Design an enzyme around this catalytic site. Sequence first.
Site, PDB file in Angstrom:
ATOM      1  N   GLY A  33      46.182  38.443  40.164  1.00  0.00           N
ATOM      2  CA  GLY A  33      45.527  37.293  40.806  1.00  0.00           C
ATOM      3  C   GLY A  33      46.554  36.228  41.187  1.00  0.00           C
ATOM      4  O   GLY A  33      47.632  36.549  41.658  1.00  0.00           O
TER       5      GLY A  33
ATOM      6  N   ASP B  54      53.124  48.898  47.177  1.00  0.00           N
ATOM      7  CA  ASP B  54      52.476  49.202  45.937  1.00  0.00           C
ATOM      8  C   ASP B  54      53.227  50.343  45.247  1.00  0.00           C
ATOM      9  O   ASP B  54      53.452  51.389  45.843  1.00  0.00           O
ATOM     10  CB  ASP B  54      51.014  49.610  46.142  1.00  0.00           C
TER      11      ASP B  54
ATOM     12  N   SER C 268      50.188  43.743  39.507  1.00  0.00           N
ATOM     13  CA  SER C 268      50.660  42.518  40.133  1.00  0.00           C
ATOM     14  C   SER C 268      51.045  41.506  39.044  1.00  0.00           C
ATOM     15  O   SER C 268      51.856  41.824  38.186  1.00  0.00           O
ATOM     16  CB  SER C 268      49.651  41.992  41.120  1.00  0.00           C
ATOM     17  N   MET C 269      50.447  40.312  39.061  1.00  0.00           N
ATOM     18  CA  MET C 269      50.741  39.290  38.073  1.00  0.00           C
ATOM     19  C   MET C 269      50.372  39.782  36.658  1.00  0.00           C
ATOM     20  O   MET C 269      50.926  39.315  35.671  1.00  0.00           O
ATOM     21  CB  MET C 269      50.021  37.987  38.420  1.00  0.00           C
TER      22      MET C 269
ATOM     23  N   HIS D 290      54.253  45.125  42.992  1.00  0.00           N
ATOM     24  CA  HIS D 290      54.325  44.988  44.446  1.00  0.00           C
ATOM     25  C   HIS D 290      54.765  43.551  44.766  1.00  0.00           C
ATOM     26  O   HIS D 290      54.976  42.754  43.854  1.00  0.00           O
ATOM     27  CB  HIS D 290      53.006  45.402  45.110  1.00  0.00           C
TER      28      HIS D 290
END
Lengths: 6, 6, 6, 6, 6, 6, 6, 6, 6, 6, 6, 6, 180, 180, 179, 179, 179, 179, 179, 179, 179, 180, 180
Positions: free
Chosen positions: O56, O159, O85-86, O110
Amino acid sequence: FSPXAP
Amino acid sequence: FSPXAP
Amino acid sequence: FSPXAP
Amino acid sequence: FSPXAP
Amino acid sequence: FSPXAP
Amino acid sequence: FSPXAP
Amino acid sequence: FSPXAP
Amino acid sequence: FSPXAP
Amino acid sequence: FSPXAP
Amino acid sequence: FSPXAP
Amino acid sequence: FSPXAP
Amino acid sequence: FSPXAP
Amino acid sequence: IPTVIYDIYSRLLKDRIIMLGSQIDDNVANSIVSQLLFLQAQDSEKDIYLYINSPGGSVTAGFAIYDTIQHIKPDVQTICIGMAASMGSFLLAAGAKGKRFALPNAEVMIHQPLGGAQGQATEIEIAANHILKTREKLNRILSERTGQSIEKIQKDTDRDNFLTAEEAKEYGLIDEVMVP
Amino acid sequence: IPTVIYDIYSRLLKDRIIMLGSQIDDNVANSIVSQLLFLQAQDSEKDIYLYINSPGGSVTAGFAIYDTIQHIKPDVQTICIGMAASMGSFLLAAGAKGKRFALPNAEVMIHQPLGGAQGQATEIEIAANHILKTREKLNRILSERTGQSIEKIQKDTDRDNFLTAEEAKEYGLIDEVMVP
Amino acid sequence: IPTVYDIYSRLLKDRIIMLGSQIDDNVANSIVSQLLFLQAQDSEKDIYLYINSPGGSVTAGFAIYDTIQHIKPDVQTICIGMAASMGSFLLAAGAKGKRFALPNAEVMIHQPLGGAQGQATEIEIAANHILKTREKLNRILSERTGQSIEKIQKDTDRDNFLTAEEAKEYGLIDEVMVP
Amino acid sequence: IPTVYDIYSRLLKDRIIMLGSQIDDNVANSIVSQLLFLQAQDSEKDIYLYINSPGGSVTAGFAIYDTIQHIKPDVQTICIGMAASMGSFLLAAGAKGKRFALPNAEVMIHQPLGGAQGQATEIEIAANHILKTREKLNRILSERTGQSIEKIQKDTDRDNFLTAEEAKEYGLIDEVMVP
Amino acid sequence: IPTVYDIYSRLLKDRIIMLGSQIDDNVANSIVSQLLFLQAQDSEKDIYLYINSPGGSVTAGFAIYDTIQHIKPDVQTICIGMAASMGSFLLAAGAKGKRFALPNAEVMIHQPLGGAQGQATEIEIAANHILKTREKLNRILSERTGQSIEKIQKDTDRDNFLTAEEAKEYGLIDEVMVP
Amino acid sequence: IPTVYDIYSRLLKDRIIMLGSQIDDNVANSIVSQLLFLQAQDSEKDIYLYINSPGGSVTAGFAIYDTIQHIKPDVQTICIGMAASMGSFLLAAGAKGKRFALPNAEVMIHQPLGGAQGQATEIEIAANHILKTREKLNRILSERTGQSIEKIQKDTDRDNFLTAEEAKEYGLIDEVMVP
Amino acid sequence: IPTVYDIYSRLLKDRIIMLGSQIDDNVANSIVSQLLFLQAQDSEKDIYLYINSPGGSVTAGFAIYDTIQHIKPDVQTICIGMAASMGSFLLAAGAKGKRFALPNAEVMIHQPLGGAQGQATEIEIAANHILKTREKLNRILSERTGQSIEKIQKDTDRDNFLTAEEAKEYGLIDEVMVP
Amino acid sequence: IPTVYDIYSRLLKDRIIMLGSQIDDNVANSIVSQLLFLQAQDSEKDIYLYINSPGGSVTAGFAIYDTIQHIKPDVQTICIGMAASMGSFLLAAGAKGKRFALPNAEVMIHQPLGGAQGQATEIEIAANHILKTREKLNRILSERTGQSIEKIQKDTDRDNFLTAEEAKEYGLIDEVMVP
Amino acid sequence: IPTVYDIYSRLLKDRIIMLGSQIDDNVANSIVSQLLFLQAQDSEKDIYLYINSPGGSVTAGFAIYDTIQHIKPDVQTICIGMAASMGSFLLAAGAKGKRFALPNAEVMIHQPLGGAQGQATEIEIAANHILKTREKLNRILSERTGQSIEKIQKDTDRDNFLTAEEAKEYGLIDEVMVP
Amino acid sequence: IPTVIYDIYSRLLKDRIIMLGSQIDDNVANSIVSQLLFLQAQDSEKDIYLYINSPGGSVTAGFAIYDTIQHIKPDVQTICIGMAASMGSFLLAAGAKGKRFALPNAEVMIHQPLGGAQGQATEIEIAANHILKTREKLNRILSERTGQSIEKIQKDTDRDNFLTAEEAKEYGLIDEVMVP
Amino acid sequence: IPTVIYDIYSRLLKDRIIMLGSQIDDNVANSIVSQLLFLQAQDSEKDIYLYINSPGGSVTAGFAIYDTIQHIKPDVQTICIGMAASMGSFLLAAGAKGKRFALPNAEVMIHQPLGGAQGQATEIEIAANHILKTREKLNRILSERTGQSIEKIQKDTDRDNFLTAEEAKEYGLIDEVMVP
């Protein structure tokens, strides 16, 4: 539609 | 559901 | 609903 | 998840 | 609404 | 709102 | 579609 | 597309 | 656009 | 619609 | 718009 | 609308 | 949801019953994982009972549950009531060997993972590689849990494949049909 | 939902009454199943009372309830108040023999299962085979519970078939009309 | 959410924090508050951050990251299910030697995502900002993993899905938690 | 909803049940449960059903009707505001001599409403069902009012609004409750 | 809604009922229940109905009206802010000599609003019903204000806004409550 | 659409029919009419069906197929761009020896698509119908290509993309049209 | 739609009428007008009605049916693609000995579809009307096919798909037009 | 569109074809028809394809490409404004030595775009198809530009904008058309 | 709409007017204009109004009705397919002895439909207007059919479907046009 | 569009007048380009007249028109009637030197190009680089056509900048205000 | 649109009548401008007649028409039929002095320009400055055409101001009411 119309 | 679950 | 359920 | 987290 | 209900 | 209601 | 239609 | 169609 | 196209 | 309109 | 365009 | 426009 | 003189699901959790009774998303997985770990902390030897009535859902959420089941010391019994489809049937098959059950009229369904991808050719390639690797991982584990070959799992999951409880037992997805 | 000096449904559950008063989905089934198992654990000999006012719903959810009823030791009495349609009427007929009731002005309706399928010819074939097998299973059980032949059940469920309480009794879906 | 306390409040009593959703400001504010509260209860005992998250907001993620590094207790990280991600950034942010994943967990890295609309000058500002954000993320990931910034840049260009074992080899985690 | 107990729970302690909304399955299940609970508390004391309802589901209405007739206590009915359709049917279902309306209350009777889509055969089944439902309603209304089935049929052919006094003359209620 | 009890429950302890919204069945059922409960607590002490309402359902309004007239206690009415349509009808329904408005309060009277769709015969029934409803409202307003039915008819033909002082002159209230 | 006649009408004068869209009833009715008109103008000269189509309705496609086989003139087929689904079926339906594709054209074959909702019996009817439709398509494709029914069944189980050269080897066309 | 005249106007010059869409009032009015116009041009020569239609409005269909039976010319019917519902009814209505289908054409027969919402009485009227419509369709189909009314009733109870050959065996058409 | 003939029809008389929109099947079918018509009018004289297009469908683009290569006349290409994606592919497809761009024209190359939804196996088929499509595009671009397939792959990985002069250096065009 | 003239313009040359849609103002204005034009061409020759209409606007219908009665030529009416509501009113409005229906045509009569929203007074005006409209329609239908106003009122209370033969017995038409 | 005893625009085109009276998209550009080339083919020496009432639009479509104007042999006079904004004002400034006009109450507006970008950091970078390069190209040409420095054009186009006809003349966007 | 033994508007244009009978957008302006220039080319001395029934619209489109009217040699008579509001009334007032008319029951309305602005403080400032400058320009020209002071125009256009034909004459927006 004839006869009679026309 | 016993026996045996529980 | 008793008698009989309960 | 212990051991060790906790 | 009494009397009479209740 | 008193007096008088109540 | 002929013959026969037309 | 000729020859041959047409 | 001529010359040359056309 | 005649007579009279036309 | 003439003169001058046209 | 004539006379005068046209 | 009725109260018993606890909400009914919290009352069942006191007897080490966990309900997986919905679509599998992250919230459901986080809750089931937390319940499994809590029950292990209360008692590391007593069986846990996972009741399954689920059309499946997220594969990663499903794997959170799967990995937690295999990690903890207690045996996790699985009971299919109603339906176990997709990741639901995967989790049914993940219960302790000898302790995977279905009720007689329960429906089990196995198939291949579903997904999507939009954008550049290279992005579609990455998405495709990922979902194919996910399928290989699911099929390998199902092979180990059922005793069927990887080749047979691949063929039998190519399209939606509905099994009766009895058929699920013959297949090796469960150990027993729970008869009245 | 009014309170009694408990919410009313929780108060009824204390007297072993379970309310099936809505459309049958997975959440309703999981709750009813949990209630049945909880009541059995409290007392394995005393009757349970399932009050039904339901237009039916999911067949798999309905079968979770059906299978739980047949599994547990207590007799489950069924009482149709208002309406029992589709899977609702199936569950009405599933109550303990001699203990299936309807109020005089209650409506019972039986019909064939409903569903859907989209995609390739082969996918539609799988969906069709599944729903036909589901219908055979429902009809066979209804035959056993009512004493009617499977041929007659097939004909009588071909389209929506509405029964009065008295007609449901004559049919064998219930045992008695509960008269004032 | 079942009662035992609600289950998450019961886990927090044992210093377990659940990061089990998309990372927005509300999630960050809650995790930060939990970390600070646990430190105040005991500044020496380990904290356990369980991660099942698609990621997010980067700024929300950095609120959590900075709080982890600020407090005295070691924060163990455990990836269950997914860290993307995060999410994977925060997994890598756990105390060295105490970052774990379950065997079938998925880790994904990514580059940051965003948007920009308006005048050329406004798009320039937005582009410069997101590139600077990426440099900051890549630098920290380099420090936490032991990989070069150059390798992180190449490996996050699209990704990139890692198994738990691959995440260990990469240096995002220290151990696969085996059955 | 003000507190005194919430007001409706306080009234239920005095055996007052409020039917103050559209009649759906949830309302029926609740009213039925209340009736049975009050009977279990005391099988001899009157129950009071206050009605302000535009009606609703016929099957839900019949769940309430059948429960009223089944239990031993007399159920008094009082129309406050409006009793329309299945609402007026339930008003008429109260114990004989104990059905009331306030002077400015509106009672409305009409025929059942419904729908049917599909094949000719399906429309036939739907039509037969709703006509049989209407016959059942009219027969019971005949018994409760003392009016012929033929008169009920004619008087319910379209919306028919009655004053409290007219509802009394019709036999839907026994008395207009005067101040 | 602040706590002191929630504020409205605290006011109900002193026999104040708030009619502070649009009048629908839920509001009516609640006000009716409050009136009956207060009468049961004490059948002699005054009740105070504070009104800030744009009106609403006529049948719901009549449930309240009839309950006010039925119970033994005097119900004082005080318009604060606005009493429009069925709101102003209920303001006028308070005990004679005990109907008040604050100086800047707005009172509005008009004819009932409604709708009708379908066959000529159905529109006729709907029209007859709403005209009969208007006659009933106007007759009662005549009795409560001392104005003729003819004058009420003319004065309610379109929206008619009154100041507190004008409402007093009209006979809708007895006194303007001055500071 | 440029004028030279509109371009398509000009091509029709030289017995070229364009099937350049999704196949629905309107497209089929137009193509059928064109085929019959060209036969009436000259029953011996070849007709040229140019195909750039993702397919569409099976029944509409069979209207075209049956008309091609009925008329006396040979119908040459040329795939330009794409012939998918019923498009590729029609490509294969051209006169033997006179089915062509341009070098970079895409041919795709697969099984028919459909849907069904309602009662078990209705789903059964829909399933039987689409399976019979598939058998009919596969049988004809077998005859037109020289492949076995068993091989056609396997090769159409999912989307199967062919180059022009592969379509020639398969027997869907006779020649790749080279520059 | 290509020009040669638009193609359909060119076909009409040779006494071909295209029924190539859903049957609504506009389509019916056009087909009826075409039939009467062709009769006026020549009262002895055959007319050709080409059918590719999923059916539609029963009354629109009967406008076409009645016009076919009224005029002196024989109306040949040819099913290309699909004749379903009122489409198949019109296919069966062609002059005896002159009803055709192409080999891969689909014919479907079933019972009429419709809808009704409102009062029990209104649903009754709608049901009676659609049942009378079905009786009328079935009677005529019996006469046109040589099948009993009882068999037509059973065979149209649900969607019933026929091949061209099956339609011939049933008596809906006289010949399959073979290539 | 002004009249002089509509302007585009007037240009077609001088063998100018306008590709001035997004490339879909309709645009392709029209351009293909124009190319074939011009060849039939004169098989030796040059044709001029003016391009101002953001690209579109790859299969539609290949219909045009293959038709260009098939016909005998040289097809000159002139980029005015923009040639992006399949637009730039078609620009590069003009006769060698006769591919032009105006000085401020924009050329853009990138990889094909698409989608895939469903089962893993279906996504695999879609991915294989779009990768094979990209290989085919890159191979042809290699032949037309003189660049390696490896360089085309790298240069089309993301949106790559070229000036006219850069397009010339790349080998997509032969000359910048200077004033 | 095929060309022979467009088909409807060709029929108008023989004094045939098509009322083949819902009756709105545009349809009425067109029919009125056609009637007046035909009268101007020849004030003695019959006009033929072919009706396939579900009805529509009463005022639009009356524009047609009044024009029919005003002009000197006899207007024959022929129901093909359906004449419902204002459609059946216009069918009945043809010259006495020259109103026809085809054997399977459907005639439907019922009461006018409308709506009203707003103040009691506005609903009253709308109701009075639609009741007066119904009286006017029923009176004219009485004159045209020979049925009493009392019988028309009863027979139009709900949708009333008539066969051609029943419409003849009723006096809406003079003859069923038989093959 | 009224008819003259031709549609009015076709009649004006007969006198070598081209109307740019809308938003600039590809269709408008393709039409204007075709008109310019057609007029050149009819007569390569006679002036063409481009009347502009446009809020601008696509930069690439605008450049198709720009490049065609500079390519052909005839002088293209430009007349701003009403409004020339963004790419509209760029094209106004592109007319033959000494033959760029505006009516007295016409509005001219200059600003920087507008656009958008969504996706990965790398994609946003590419989009930003592209629009900045587009702005440099526009500003360079405007510098050449107006006689103002690139630095001044950059500052004056940073936000919407509205000019009267007289101000546009002073700026060098036009040569003369067309007075009555 | 009826035909006369031409479409009616094309027939009126043959007698030098131009209809401004809709909302003023760029398309309407481009058409009116083209018609004015065409009529001037046919005959530079004969009057043109602009019939106005318009609620107004775009100010820049309106100014294209205004400037063209003032530029051409022929007098342009203006006749308000029905309504001339906003830019419609501005154009009515722009007709040749002594030859501006309205029918007796025609409605004329004057007010200030309408617009909008969103974004940064600086952007709103630019938009505000622009619309205020536009208003000053409109008011100045209206002052010149009516003989009213700028101060009075400013006050009288502050909100919607409806005028009868007679009032429009008194104001100086027209010269005569056209009486039957």
